[PDB]
Write a protein that binds this ligand. Structure first.
Ligand code: 9QN
Ligand code: NA
Ligand code: NA
Ligand code: NA
Length: 134
């Protein structure tokens, strides 16, 4: 499928370029992140709930979801989101804003038929962790 190949090529090229940039931390899983603003709060565990502000975009800059201008943050259980978020959240002190770069395998994978997120899409998120509930 043409889109699956295109998205894989673009994502791999992005991650390969981004890993060299100052402030980009590359984890063993392949998840990448960059600290935008450091917070001093607790880090959530895998069973915790979090309140967050966030924006998700594709490599070409297209925003596909955001809490911005909605008037409310979003709430998630740490383990009930995509793996890249589950992993990233557990490293984030409350109060922090990070940009995370999620390889498609830690997001929706290669059979993501279509919709907002098609196959082999590497996803980029700005995540402001507001609070953690144990
Ligand atoms: O795991 C998630 C991730 C990470 C947390 C923020 C959002 C939530 C918004 O509810 C969606 N999920 C879980 C989810 C639930 C149902 C279907 C697909 N993904 N997403 S997302 O990647 O921005 C996203 C947002 C939207 Cl509108 C559609 C999709 Cl398919 C994915
Ligand atoms: Na693409
Ligand atoms: Na707002
Ligand atoms: Na912050």
């Amino acid at each position: 499928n043409k889109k699956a190949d295109e998205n894989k090529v673009k994502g791999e090229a992005f991650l390969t370029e981004n890993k060299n940039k100052p402030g980009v931390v590359v984890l063993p899983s392949g998840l990448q992140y960059k600290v935008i603003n450091s917070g001093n709060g607790v880090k959530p565990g895998k069973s915790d709930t979090v309140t967050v502000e966030y924006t998700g975009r594709l490599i070409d800059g297209t925003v596909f979801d955001s809490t911005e201008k909605t008037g409310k943050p979003a709430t998630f259980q740490v383990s009930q989101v995509i793996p890249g978020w589950t992993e990233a959240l557990q490293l984030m002190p409350a109060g922090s804003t990070w940009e995370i770069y999620v390889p498609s395998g830690l997001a929706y994978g290669p059979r993501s038929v279509g919709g907002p997120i098609g196959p082999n899409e590497t996803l980029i998120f700005k995540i402001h962790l507001i609070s953690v509930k144990k």
